[PDB]
Every structure is written in C-alpha cells, then in structure tokens.
C-alpha cells in the first residue's frame, strides 16, 4: 500500500465530470475543477487542465496524469508550509501518507487549521489525536473516509485499507 493506492481507494476514479460530496465539479481521481456552480465553468477549467477540447470527458491516462500532479503538489505543499513541514518530518512513513491524504482532500490551509491535532501528532499522542481529529466537520461529513485516515494516524499501519 502506498499514498497513490490509498488515495485511489478514497477518491475513486471517474472519467466524466461529476459532483463531489460537497457538490463541486470534479473529474478523475478527486481532482476538484471548480467551486463554481457552472458546468460550463467546469468544462472550461477541465480543458485548460488537459490541454485539449474535452467536452467533459477524459481518458484513464489523462486522469492519472492529473493524479500524479496533485499528489506531487500536495507533498510540496506540505514541505513549504511552516505549520505542516515539522509535523511531516516528525512522522513515520505510514502517518506521512495520512497527512498527504488529508491535504489532498482539503487543501494546506484546511489541514493547517487542525492546530490541536497537529500538535498531538507531533507529540506522538496517537489516541488523543484520533479523538480530537473526530471533532470536525470533516469527520461528520465523510465519516468512513475520515475513519480510515484517522486509523492510519492512530496505528501507523495500513489496516483500515486492507479491507478495501
């Protein structure tokens, strides 16, 4: 199991524009296109991203290309953030995957707001941090995914995903 397979389990793969859990226009492997309510705004962002007239639909390959970019951007994002970097450096390889998952889903900024949870992870207070992370809109909105990520942080193993 690695961050790519982990994320592919959590986000799915869709070759046609679709609306995410929040109602936003997405395609491929959880690639947010726009928060705009316009499907036209969405197809435009899509064509810009792919470099061709897509007409709302992409190939597997194009989806994977977007995915490669996004994982890379999430990692670099962590490494550039002064709140995230240190947490990341303090974690083992499994937990790192967990932070990348979070950041991929909810942007740098978002995650950076889990101040208290970040501190607990940093201090290796696994159980406490699992409990704190659950007190969030994130957890309430997408409980099955949040639970999987949470488990990953609590145990430092890929158990939650071995299942899936």
XYZ file of N, CA, C and O in Angstrom:
656
model
N 0.871 -1.142 0.000
C 0.000 0.000 0.000
C 0.910 1.194 0.000
O 1.978 1.142 0.612
N 0.528 2.212 -0.753
C 1.271 3.455 -0.866
C 0.248 4.593 -0.982
O -0.919 4.316 -1.149
N 0.668 5.841 -0.875
C -0.192 7.019 -0.947
C -1.077 6.999 -2.206
O -2.261 7.372 -2.190
N -0.523 6.576 -3.333
C -1.329 6.533 -4.579
C -2.481 5.541 -4.507
O -3.591 5.841 -4.889
N -2.217 4.318 -4.068
C -3.269 3.355 -3.946
C -4.162 3.772 -2.857
O -5.332 3.496 -2.904
N -3.620 4.385 -1.823
C -4.531 4.788 -0.718
C -5.525 5.792 -1.225
O -6.719 5.734 -0.929
N -5.011 6.784 -1.937
C -5.894 7.820 -2.478
C -6.854 7.330 -3.551
O -7.946 7.851 -3.708
N -6.411 6.382 -4.341
C -7.266 5.841 -5.343
C -8.456 5.110 -4.676
O -9.573 5.177 -5.118
N -8.258 4.511 -3.505
C -9.351 3.858 -2.764
C -10.325 4.915 -2.191
O -11.539 4.851 -2.289
N -9.785 5.962 -1.639
C -10.596 7.010 -1.067
C -11.381 7.915 -2.023
O -12.417 8.443 -1.640
N -10.867 8.144 -3.221
C -11.474 9.083 -4.145
C -12.195 8.471 -5.317
O -12.986 9.145 -5.947
N -11.831 7.247 -5.686
C -12.437 6.590 -6.815
C -11.839 7.150 -8.053
O -10.908 7.957 -7.971
N -12.345 6.683 -9.179
C -11.920 7.162 -10.485
C -13.140 7.382 -11.333
O -13.882 6.462 -11.521
N -13.334 8.589 -11.829
C -14.453 8.960 -12.683
C -13.957 9.656 -13.940
O -13.206 10.618 -13.859
N -14.328 9.139 -15.109
C -13.871 9.702 -16.355
C -14.753 10.760 -16.917
O -14.434 11.303 -17.984
N -15.826 11.062 -16.192
C -16.774 12.062 -16.665
C -16.965 13.131 -15.570
O -16.885 12.796 -14.361
N -17.125 14.445 -15.923
C -17.261 15.425 -14.805
C -18.290 14.937 -13.848
O -19.300 14.422 -14.277
N -18.085 15.170 -12.579
C -19.068 14.719 -11.646
C -19.071 15.670 -10.498
O -18.230 16.550 -10.484
N -20.023 15.533 -9.572
C -20.050 16.406 -8.421
C -19.547 15.650 -7.242
O -19.976 14.532 -6.988
N -18.665 16.258 -6.500
C -18.122 15.621 -5.356
C -19.135 15.592 -4.195
O -20.264 16.056 -4.327
N -18.706 15.127 -3.039
C -19.563 15.033 -1.870
C -20.093 16.389 -1.482
O -21.174 16.441 -0.929
N -19.342 17.476 -1.737
C -19.758 18.849 -1.391
C -20.610 19.530 -2.464
O -21.120 20.615 -2.289
N -20.719 18.882 -3.595
C -21.461 19.396 -4.708
C -20.569 20.018 -5.767
O -21.101 20.521 -6.732
N -19.243 19.985 -5.639
C -18.405 20.612 -6.653
C -17.983 19.719 -7.780
O -17.811 18.528 -7.604
N -17.772 20.361 -8.920
C -17.349 19.754 -10.173
C -15.937 19.200 -10.058
O -15.021 19.975 -9.744
N -15.829 17.858 -10.269
C -14.615 17.050 -10.116
C -14.498 16.103 -11.315
O -15.430 15.886 -12.083
N -13.322 15.573 -11.527
C -13.120 14.585 -12.567
C -11.931 13.704 -12.123
O -11.204 14.070 -11.223
N -11.749 12.545 -12.728
C -10.628 11.664 -12.442
C -10.608 11.138 -11.046
O -11.610 10.605 -10.556
N -9.447 11.325 -10.430
C -9.232 10.863 -9.067
C -9.238 12.005 -8.066
O -8.182 12.461 -7.579
N -10.450 12.507 -7.775
C -10.676 13.596 -6.828
C -10.072 14.943 -7.231
O -9.776 15.778 -6.377
N -9.896 15.176 -8.529
C -9.373 16.450 -8.945
C -10.475 17.518 -8.989
O -11.244 17.519 -9.953
N -10.540 18.405 -7.987
C -11.513 19.476 -7.972
C -11.323 20.405 -9.178
O -10.227 20.841 -9.543
N -12.389 20.653 -9.901
C -12.223 21.523 -11.058
C -12.564 22.966 -10.738
O -11.850 23.896 -11.099
N -13.695 23.156 -10.074
C -14.178 24.479 -9.708
C -15.184 24.372 -8.591
O -15.861 23.362 -8.482
N -15.287 25.430 -7.784
C -16.305 25.513 -6.772
C -17.533 26.183 -7.349
O -18.593 26.152 -6.753
N -17.375 26.750 -8.554
C -18.432 27.395 -9.335
C -19.572 26.477 -9.767
O -19.420 25.312 -10.186
N -20.746 27.051 -9.680
C -21.894 26.288 -9.975
C -22.131 26.060 -11.427
O -23.029 25.306 -11.809
N -21.241 26.622 -12.241
C -21.427 26.426 -13.660
C -20.668 25.246 -14.278
O -19.443 25.152 -14.187
N -21.427 24.369 -14.938
C -20.859 23.216 -15.602
C -20.021 23.662 -16.792
O -19.140 22.969 -17.342
N -20.336 24.865 -17.205
C -19.589 25.446 -18.287
C -18.303 25.963 -17.716
O -17.262 25.816 -18.302
N -18.358 26.533 -16.525
C -17.127 26.966 -15.919
C -16.239 25.734 -15.748
O -15.053 25.755 -16.037
N -16.850 24.629 -15.308
C -16.211 23.321 -15.091
C -15.556 22.767 -16.333
O -14.420 22.293 -16.250
N -16.240 22.802 -17.483
C -15.623 22.194 -18.678
C -14.465 23.010 -19.209
O -13.562 22.543 -19.921
N -14.523 24.271 -18.872
C -13.519 25.209 -19.287
C -12.199 24.970 -18.510
O -11.112 24.896 -19.081
N -12.347 24.817 -17.200
C -11.265 24.525 -16.277
C -10.700 23.164 -16.688
O -9.509 22.940 -16.813
N -11.591 22.254 -17.029
C -11.150 20.948 -17.459
C -10.275 20.971 -18.706
O -9.238 20.298 -18.768
N -10.700 21.714 -19.727
C -9.948 21.794 -20.992
C -8.578 22.463 -20.828
O -7.620 22.155 -21.533
N -8.555 23.436 -19.909
C -7.367 24.204 -19.560
C -6.384 23.225 -18.902
O -5.203 23.176 -19.233
N -6.907 22.381 -18.014
C -6.091 21.416 -17.303
C -5.477 20.313 -18.175
O -4.314 19.945 -18.006
N -6.238 19.832 -19.147
C -5.863 18.728 -20.034
C -5.144 19.190 -21.301
O -4.380 18.448 -21.934
N -5.386 20.427 -21.707
C -4.729 20.927 -22.904
C -5.402 20.526 -24.219
O -4.766 20.540 -25.277
N -6.700 20.187 -24.166
C -7.469 19.843 -25.373
C -8.933 20.070 -25.132
O -9.300 20.252 -23.974
N -9.756 20.005 -26.197
C -11.206 20.129 -26.075
C -11.763 18.875 -25.494
O -11.859 17.844 -26.176
N -12.120 18.889 -24.252
C -12.508 17.591 -23.785
C -13.945 17.294 -23.889
O -14.320 16.145 -23.884
N -14.743 18.325 -23.854
C -16.140 18.073 -23.874
C -16.568 17.312 -22.604
O -17.462 16.509 -22.644
N -15.968 17.548 -21.442
C -16.416 16.896 -20.192
C -15.905 15.463 -19.955
O -16.158 14.817 -18.942
N -15.152 14.928 -20.888
C -14.730 13.579 -20.664
C -13.278 13.404 -20.897
O -12.796 13.872 -21.929
N -12.609 12.635 -20.033
C -11.175 12.357 -20.215
C -10.876 10.826 -20.228
O -11.713 10.005 -19.861
N -9.670 10.458 -20.662
C -9.194 9.086 -20.723
C -8.543 8.734 -19.367
O -8.244 9.625 -18.571
N -8.290 7.444 -19.129
C -7.681 6.935 -17.898
C -6.348 7.586 -17.646
O -6.019 7.988 -16.534
N -5.581 7.601 -18.726
C -4.273 8.196 -18.821
C -4.257 9.648 -18.358
O -3.358 10.003 -17.603
N -5.236 10.455 -18.834
C -5.339 11.869 -18.500
C -5.672 12.004 -17.050
O -5.215 12.904 -16.397
N -6.502 11.090 -16.558
C -6.865 11.112 -15.166
C -5.667 10.824 -14.310
O -5.544 11.407 -13.261
N -4.858 9.856 -14.724
C -3.708 9.518 -13.953
C -2.670 10.614 -13.981
O -1.929 10.810 -13.018
N -2.626 11.331 -15.092
C -1.684 12.453 -15.197
C -2.035 13.555 -14.195
O -1.202 14.023 -13.420
N -3.325 13.882 -14.140
C -3.825 14.839 -13.166
C -3.478 14.353 -11.742
O -3.099 15.131 -10.891
N -3.675 13.069 -11.483
C -3.458 12.477 -10.191
C -1.986 12.621 -9.805
O -1.662 13.047 -8.705
N -1.089 12.270 -10.720
C 0.341 12.412 -10.455
C 0.657 13.866 -10.043
O 1.418 14.181 -9.100
N 0.042 14.810 -10.733
C 0.339 16.222 -10.410
C -0.134 16.640 -9.072
O 0.471 17.470 -8.404
N -1.317 16.149 -8.741
C -1.936 16.520 -7.497
C -1.252 15.976 -6.266
O -1.305 16.602 -5.190
N -0.685 14.755 -6.376
C -0.032 14.121 -5.223
C 1.264 14.896 -4.985
O 1.653 15.288 -3.867
N 1.922 15.163 -6.109
C 3.163 15.918 -6.084
C 2.926 17.316 -5.487
O 3.650 17.771 -4.606
N 1.896 18.014 -5.951
C 1.606 19.341 -5.437
C 1.261 19.268 -3.946
O 1.620 20.141 -3.183
N 0.541 18.219 -3.500
C 0.171 18.101 -2.071
C 1.461 17.946 -1.255
O 1.643 18.606 -0.238
N 2.352 17.009 -1.663
C 3.611 16.811 -0.921
C 4.437 18.132 -0.786
O 4.867 18.502 0.297
N 4.663 18.840 -1.909
C 5.421 20.094 -1.970
C 4.713 21.167 -1.169
O 5.298 21.969 -0.463
N 3.405 21.111 -1.200
C 2.637 21.999 -0.399
C 2.981 21.810 1.081
O 3.175 22.774 1.816
N 3.071 20.570 1.534
C 3.382 20.262 2.939
C 4.765 20.742 3.276
O 5.054 21.331 4.327
N 5.668 20.475 2.353
C 7.047 20.806 2.605
C 7.326 22.288 2.705
O 8.268 22.628 3.396
N 6.459 23.142 2.073
C 6.518 24.628 2.048
C 5.724 25.313 3.138
O 5.756 26.517 3.323
N 4.922 24.568 3.796
C 4.111 25.141 4.800
C 4.857 25.084 6.123
O 5.416 24.074 6.525
N 4.917 26.184 6.812
C 5.656 26.210 8.055
C 4.943 25.519 9.208
O 5.533 25.165 10.199
N 3.666 25.255 9.081
C 2.977 24.549 10.139
C 3.020 23.052 9.864
O 3.047 22.195 10.747
N 3.014 22.713 8.607
C 2.927 21.309 8.255
C 4.249 20.539 8.210
O 4.337 19.363 8.599
N 5.259 21.231 7.683
C 6.555 20.685 7.480
C 7.108 19.921 8.671
O 7.530 18.773 8.569
N 7.086 20.550 9.815
C 7.643 19.953 11.013
C 6.857 18.757 11.401
O 7.416 17.827 11.945
N 5.526 18.786 11.188
C 4.736 17.619 11.602
C 5.120 16.410 10.726
O 5.406 15.301 11.190
N 5.179 16.705 9.435
C 5.534 15.742 8.445
C 6.901 15.138 8.769
O 7.045 13.947 8.884
N 7.910 15.968 9.001
C 9.261 15.499 9.360
C 9.247 14.657 10.620
O 10.034 13.746 10.791
N 8.340 14.921 11.516
C 8.383 14.095 12.689
C 7.725 12.734 12.490
O 7.876 11.856 13.331
N 6.941 12.538 11.436
C 6.184 11.283 11.327
C 6.877 10.139 10.626
O 7.682 10.415 9.728
N 6.454 8.880 10.932
C 6.904 7.698 10.189
C 6.306 7.636 8.757
O 5.507 8.498 8.363
N 6.685 6.654 7.936
C 6.210 6.665 6.586
C 4.711 6.494 6.373
O 4.170 7.092 5.450
N 4.065 5.699 7.239
C 2.631 5.441 7.120
C 1.829 6.710 7.453
O 1.014 7.190 6.638
N 2.088 7.267 8.642
C 1.451 8.504 9.063
C 1.672 9.629 8.057
O 0.746 10.395 7.821
N 2.864 9.710 7.417
C 3.069 10.724 6.396
C 1.999 10.641 5.293
O 1.457 11.685 4.895
N 1.735 9.395 4.821
C 0.709 9.109 3.821
C -0.651 9.661 4.281
O -1.393 10.288 3.496
N -0.933 9.496 5.588
C -2.148 10.021 6.201
C -2.264 11.539 6.115
O -3.321 12.070 5.835
N -1.188 12.261 6.342
C -1.205 13.707 6.235
C -1.328 14.119 4.779
O -2.004 15.100 4.465
N -0.668 13.392 3.874
C -0.800 13.759 2.474
C -2.269 13.583 2.030
O -2.822 14.398 1.263
N -2.921 12.523 2.552
C -4.337 12.226 2.223
C -5.212 13.393 2.630
O -5.944 13.932 1.811
N -5.051 13.824 3.873
C -5.784 14.966 4.368
C -5.621 16.209 3.513
O -6.587 16.914 3.192
N -4.383 16.515 3.210
C -4.076 17.727 2.482
C -4.573 17.695 1.019
O -4.940 18.702 0.407
N -4.560 16.497 0.445
C -5.011 16.289 -0.901
C -6.500 16.636 -0.956
O -6.896 17.350 -1.818
N -7.294 16.142 0.010
C -8.742 16.329 0.181
C -9.170 17.744 0.576
O -10.201 18.264 0.196
N -8.448 18.349 1.465
C -8.935 19.586 1.941
C -7.978 20.768 1.873
O -8.148 21.745 2.603
N -6.986 20.707 0.974
C -6.008 21.797 0.883
C -5.167 22.051 2.172
O -5.565 21.709 3.279
N -3.988 22.677 1.987
C -2.981 23.030 3.003
C -3.595 23.779 4.164
O -3.481 23.455 5.376
N -4.181 24.870 3.720
C -4.852 25.772 4.591
C -5.779 25.013 5.511
O -5.648 25.110 6.754
N -6.701 24.250 4.897
C -7.610 23.471 5.721
C -6.876 22.789 6.897
O -7.029 23.192 8.089
N -6.077 21.756 6.529
C -5.302 20.966 7.460
C -4.533 21.760 8.440
O -4.578 21.387 9.620
N -3.842 22.812 7.937
C -3.122 23.691 8.825
C -4.010 24.185 10.012
O -3.448 24.411 11.098
N -5.396 24.204 9.854
C -6.382 24.596 10.935
C -6.673 23.486 12.027
O -7.428 23.543 13.049
N -6.045 22.383 11.833
C -6.276 21.397 12.804
C -5.115 21.578 13.784
O -4.343 20.703 14.088
N -4.960 22.777 14.260
C -3.869 23.116 15.136
C -3.592 22.152 16.235
O -2.448 21.803 16.444
N -4.627 21.844 17.019
C -4.510 20.975 18.198
C -4.116 19.525 17.863
O -3.336 18.875 18.591
N -4.718 19.012 16.774
C -4.476 17.664 16.275
C -3.052 17.604 15.790
O -2.389 16.625 16.004
N -2.601 18.657 15.075
C -1.243 18.718 14.569
C -0.257 18.614 15.714
O 0.718 17.889 15.651
N -0.540 19.311 16.788
C 0.336 19.308 17.946
C 0.435 17.943 18.570
O 1.536 17.501 18.928
N -0.716 17.256 18.647
C -0.767 15.923 19.228
C -0.022 14.919 18.344
O 0.700 14.023 18.791
N -0.150 15.057 17.051
C 0.544 14.115 16.206
C 2.045 14.293 16.440
O 2.807 13.373 16.644
N 2.455 15.551 16.429
C 3.815 15.912 16.621
C 4.357 15.354 17.905
O 5.520 14.960 18.020
N 3.507 15.350 18.917
C 3.972 14.824 20.162
C 3.814 13.340 20.270
O 4.093 12.857 21.336
N 3.351 12.647 19.211
C 3.131 11.182 19.193
C 2.081 10.684 20.121
O 2.176 9.533 20.558
N 1.076 11.528 20.355
C -0.040 11.154 21.193
C -1.196 10.698 20.313
O -2.198 11.405 20.052
N -0.972 9.483 19.838
C -1.826 8.802 18.894
C -3.314 8.727 19.145
O -4.086 9.101 18.276
N -3.677 8.216 20.311
C -5.059 8.045 20.712
C -5.737 9.381 20.899
O -6.835 9.596 20.408
N -5.039 10.313 21.532
C -5.625 11.607 21.786
C -5.835 12.332 20.502
O -6.828 13.039 20.314
N -4.844 12.221 19.642
C -5.047 12.919 18.409
C -6.214 12.323 17.560
O -6.829 13.026 16.790
N -6.487 11.010 17.649
C -7.566 10.346 16.900
C -8.893 10.902 17.384
O -9.733 11.276 16.567
N -9.032 10.986 18.726
C -10.202 11.558 19.339
C -10.402 13.019 18.906
O -11.496 13.379 18.537
N -9.364 13.878 18.923
C -9.504 15.276 18.540
C -9.849 15.403 17.052
O -10.591 16.261 16.625
N -9.247 14.595 16.204
C -9.474 14.736 14.777
C -10.945 14.517 14.415
O -11.369 14.976 13.369
N -11.666 13.701 15.234
C -13.040 13.293 15.004
C -14.058 14.353 15.278
O -15.190 14.229 14.836
N -13.624 15.378 16.003
C -14.421 16.556 16.349
C -14.227 17.587 15.281
O -13.587 18.604 15.466
N -14.691 17.265 14.117
C -14.523 18.123 12.980
C -15.638 17.909 11.948
O -16.175 16.806 11.802
N -15.937 18.968 11.217
C -16.922 18.894 10.171
C -16.502 17.774 9.210
O -17.309 17.002 8.727
N -15.188 17.707 8.936
C -14.550 16.727 8.037
C -15.027 15.323 8.347
O -15.436 14.598 7.435
N -14.925 14.949 9.658
C -15.319 13.661 10.157
C -16.809 13.496 9.978
O -17.262 12.479 9.504
N -17.598 14.512 10.383
C -19.087 14.436 10.279
C -19.609 14.276 8.827
O -20.534 13.523 8.528
N -18.958 14.984 7.906
C -19.306 14.961 6.518
C -18.945 13.695 5.774
O -19.717 13.253 4.917
N -17.753 13.156 6.025
C -17.313 11.950 5.324
C -16.708 11.032 6.304
O -15.501 10.883 6.236
N -17.539 10.483 7.210
C -17.144 9.578 8.287
C -16.331 8.315 7.915
O -15.402 8.013 8.611
N -16.690 7.563 6.882
C -15.988 6.342 6.501
C -14.563 6.644 6.043
O -13.604 5.989 6.420
N -14.411 7.676 5.234
C -13.077 8.059 4.819
C -12.278 8.638 6.014
O -11.106 8.287 6.226
N -12.894 9.592 6.760
C -12.255 10.194 7.907
C -11.791 9.093 8.851
O -10.649 9.063 9.249
N -12.648 8.119 9.130
C -12.299 6.990 9.995
C -11.109 6.243 9.475
O -10.270 5.853 10.253
N -11.038 6.032 8.151
C -9.887 5.314 7.636
C -8.624 6.102 7.868
O -7.606 5.527 8.196
N -8.677 7.424 7.635
C -7.466 8.247 7.769
C -7.027 8.321 9.202
O -5.835 8.219 9.561
N -8.045 8.444 10.018
C -7.836 8.538 11.429
C -7.086 7.333 11.978
O -6.149 7.485 12.742
N -7.522 6.139 11.563
C -6.957 4.834 11.929
C -5.535 4.763 11.526
O -4.742 4.176 12.223
N -5.270 5.301 10.332
C -3.948 5.339 9.815
C -3.058 6.179 10.760
O -1.952 5.799 11.119
N -3.584 7.296 11.260
C -2.814 8.119 12.190
C -2.646 7.471 13.544
O -1.595 7.603 14.140
N -3.731 6.854 14.063
C -3.731 6.205 15.373
C -2.767 5.024 15.495
O -2.051 4.952 16.479
N -2.780 4.105 14.502
C -1.995 2.877 14.446
C -0.730 2.935 13.628
O 0.132 2.117 13.769
N -0.632 3.796 12.683
C 0.571 3.772 11.936
C 0.673 2.535 11.032
O 1.719 2.236 10.475
N -0.428 1.826 10.812
C -0.461 0.699 9.861
C -1.498 0.999 8.785
O -2.232 1.975 8.893
N -1.533 0.175 7.746
C -2.476 0.317 6.656
C -3.671 -0.591 6.896
O -4.390 -0.933 5.958
N -3.930 -0.981 8.147
C -5.076 -1.872 8.392
C -6.443 -1.504 7.808
O -7.138 -2.361 7.308
N -6.843 -0.242 7.943
C -8.138 0.319 7.530
C -8.353 0.190 6.046
O -9.454 0.267 5.503
N -7.265 0.021 5.368
C -7.348 -0.069 3.930
C -7.141 -1.476 3.421
O -7.136 -1.670 2.206
N -6.853 -2.424 4.334
C -6.527 -3.783 3.905
C -7.703 -4.599 3.492
O -7.731 -5.449 2.600
N -8.708 -4.133 4.133
C -10.066 -4.447 3.945
C -10.516 -4.296 2.450
O -11.001 -5.225 1.792
N -10.346 -3.054 1.952
C -10.824 -2.410 0.712
C -10.110 -2.602 -0.639
O -10.631 -2.144 -1.701
